[PDB]
Write a protein that binds this ligand. Structure first.
Ligand SMILES: *[C@@H]1O[C@H](CO)[C@@H](O)[C@H](O)[C@H]1NC(C)=O
Lengths: 49, 49
């Protein structure tokens, strides 16, 4: 997993991580990763938390 | 030093201060001030910390 290339795919501003830090994702080793994708409204982004 | 005129020079939103507060900068008296200027990408601003 190379998390330093994600910035080259989408025009977002910054991550928002809860249990870890965005800069420390290149050192830890996990068991499985899951990715969920969808489209919502502008003011409903704060509800994903 | 008058830090209330800085808002009239650049179209930024707000300060981001770490050791002090932006509203209390008119009272303290320092020894020297340094200013560094450059241009970076949009998503690399969060790395200046
Ligand atoms: C720096 O500040 C103004 C904005 O108030 C800018 O338009 C201009 O390039 C500079 N000021 C002058 C007098 O040139």
């Amino acid at each position: 997993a190379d998390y330093s290339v994600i910035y080259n795919f989408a025009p977002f501003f910054a991550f928002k991580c809860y249990g870890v830090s965005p800069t420390k994702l290149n050192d830890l080793c996990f068991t499985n990763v899951y990715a969920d994708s969808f489209v919502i409204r502008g003011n409903e982004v704060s509800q994903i938390a």
